[model samples]
Target: DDWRCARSMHEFSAKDIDGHMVNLDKYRGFVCIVTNVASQCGKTEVNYTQLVDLHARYAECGLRILAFPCNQFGKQEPGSNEEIKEFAAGYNVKFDMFSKICVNGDDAHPLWKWMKIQPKGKGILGNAIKWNFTKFLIDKNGCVVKRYGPMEEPLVIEKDLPHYF
Candidate 1:
């Protein structure tokens, strides 16, 4: 009953930047950091750079950073998927990137909707994501561990990572 109540991420699927369906099952038992991103956001550089660095540092240790581009915030990410890829590539991003998805309101992706309802490990509790770069940390067991707002950089979040691994 509890498992069904608090569903594991493996139950979800999403399209990658190339539009191919990607099952979240692969990330099971891995420390996952899911973020809603935007290429034109001011924090893009900081988040992308640190996300790449963090992925490189912890990937071998079972950390998977899933970045989902979203234009819902200020129409900032209006580029096509390829353009978004190029933008992230310019920042040396090597982690997994997904197609755009709304993180709030009626059009929110199902995964995002599910994530929003999970217990708040940090910050305030609510389904309304304040802005782009909102991050959700998932433990190896596929449970929500914490939530970080747009201002929480990857480097800073890493401090709590060791505890999960």
Candidate 2:
């Protein structure tokens, strides 16, 4: 099951706050988890803090999170990049964060398209991400190792991190 750690993932060149292209290649050799976040979601702070804790505890182990804010989930994330940066900072988040992007529908980002292709379990698949805070867990080899719903907090996944290392 941990074969995912040896699988390589697709790369993307997306924009950051100042609109500079953020190349995912920069994080090679790290276990990266990417997610779509919303500012007005019910689970924002809880997930954010848990992600922050994961970052603080595992940064040395090369665990990184790429937070991509979106508005498709009931329009919960409508803030600009700077505002999102502020909210994340306020919550003490310490992971790598990216600019806004759609994780579903026709305009879905290329990276997410690759992400959606990875099945969660036997006979289980992900369509366009339906809500904010949809998570994609990537292994050191860049594969989309796992994806979680907003209801799944980072603390819940702590038990599974050692497999990647």
Candidate 3:
């Protein structure tokens, strides 16, 4: 539970949809909304659409979203990377979508592992991801601003984004 918001952000290099490594360092000085998404979740379509809109509106202003699909939530997303990419494309999603990764347990991806290490709920354990759609907000300077639960709606956070811009 040592995910220090002031730890200068965690360095990461993960493959994107086309298998090219995406270096997190490139996004330095940009506010990022890092989230784990599930294609089978009830909020899939709406969040995908709205996330696209949010990215489109704020991309030019140093706001970026790093969305990765996962299968840890109720076995919702079991497709390969190709299928997930196709689904996002069909919805005109423009943000970066990464390879499918597990969010918890022994098979958890490295990024998720790091996220889990982050201190929980301002006073909780750092183990286990509550559910899909869990979000971590980072400021432009790579400071962890806040964390949101799976049930927390994106718009609730979106409304406060402009203040950071």
Candidate 4:
């Protein structure tokens, strides 16, 4: 079946930083936060910190933060898989971090393409991701419920969480 037509985010899969395949279907019933991340972007400090904090606070409650490293923005994420892992570790990231991907252009990952077209919620007003740390919030059922820009802090995204949980 065409994955785009699937009701949830389970149809997608991608490599982790170590190049091991990760089937996203494993996250089916979790409220997931999918974002295209960059290791050195100026916003990385706030965004990454808040993401880790959110995970620490809600992971036991079933929140899954899936971060995909991307270098397409300002060459900010230029690094090997090992380097990326180290950078995330520097920030104390505890959530899932996937292999690098292009979140825009023709080479965009299938999951990112699908996310762009899902029904948008408030503050989510674009089809193309503008920069790194652009986040997509998926409900427990896998529908992309909302989109958030890089500047939207993790705490800001948290305000919308209660509705999904």
Candidate 5:
């Protein structure tokens, strides 16, 4: 089924919260849960909570959670990267967090630009991120396995990690 997905994530790289460009290639051979984040949003608490626990429970199982903050949704995320790093500190975020980027629009990050071309929930509108926390599940081989909307719980996404691990 991966035949339909032609690109690999290894070609992508994103800036981390601490201001370093981290290559996705370092995550090669690992299953990754990539999502957009917003601290002021209503889902922040629950999603951040579950995400920490999820990564703690399964990082050894080969799961890597990559978070990118976006302000396009209700302008919910307005903190500077340093402020976000501190806010995330309160939640004890354990996975990779990135600098803020527009998830939808001409200025969208190049990595997201490519993700928009991947399979989208078997749903057409899935390409444009409808809201914050929109998630992507990337297989160990660096191709997207599935896409999840804002309301999809991180644990629900967890259900598929083991499938790939």
Candidate 6:
């Protein structure tokens, strides 16, 4: 079997802006919107604001948003981790953020590589996420649930939350 296969996010890990390794297992009881972001995209404004608002609404309810700043698409996020975190000023965004990661090609993060091949519950398919802000809905048990394109805002996906709860 290909090593890309995963039943739950517990099988994966990535680094944070602080450069510490993050184990997805820590979010075992949380619902999450895992997304690739950039501080330089058209959707960045809405995505950032909505994600902040979205996390605020549910963080008390055990909800989490995982944001990864990416520079792979159109040179969108050419900043260092520190520079990236600067945009996180929610006065410090309430959600979790990570060191940048590519979501496509051989350089793709292992966790993201698994997320793209995820089976869409609607009898269709998700792709190798062509744009930034590509988001995945991950459940409390670390299970993959759904995928949203960069065009789909986080607030729009908020309605799809709660079911996995």
> Judged by TM-score, which candidate is best?
4
Task: List RMSD in Å for every model shown.
Answer: 2.6, 4.7, 3.1, 2.0, 3.5, 2.4
Candidate 2's C-alpha runs over 4 A off are 1-10, 121-125, 163-165
TM-score of each: 0.91, 0.87, 0.85, 0.92, 0.91, 0.91
Q: What is the lDDT of residue 145 in candidate 5?
A: 84
**Candidate 1 residue runs with Cα over 4 Å from true position:** 1-6, 121-125
Q: Per model, how many backbone clashes are there?
A: 0, 3, 0, 0, 0, 1
Can you write out model 5's per-residue Cα lDDT over 1-116, one digit (the tens) per residue? 33224378888788998889998899898888889999878998998998999989989988898999888998899989999999888999888999999877777887787777
* Candidate 6: segments with Cα more than 4 A from true spot: 1-3, 121-126, 163-165
Predicted structure 6: lDDT: 0.82
Kindly list the per-residue Cα lDDT of model 2 for residues 20-87, writing each as its tens digit.
Answer: 88877887888877888888988888889888888888888888888888888898888899998888
Compose the digit string of candidate 6's lDDT tens values, residues 26-139: 999898889898988887888999898888888888889899888888999999999888878743597888999887788888887777666752213436677788788888
Q: Give one digit per residue, the lDDT tens place, for model 3 in 96-145.
A: 88888787776776666666565532313445777788877777765566
Candidate 4 per-residue lDDT, tens place, 1-165, comes to: 374576667888899988999998899779999998997888889999999999999998899999999999899999988899899999999899888899887788888888887777233455888888988899888888888888888788888886544
Clash pairs (backbone) in predicted model 3:
none
Give the Cα-based TM-score of candidate 2 against the true structure.
Answer: 0.87
TM for candidate 3 is 0.85
lDDT of candidates 1 onward, in order: 0.84, 0.74, 0.75, 0.85, 0.84, 0.82
Off by over 4 Å in 3: 1-6, 119-127, 162-164
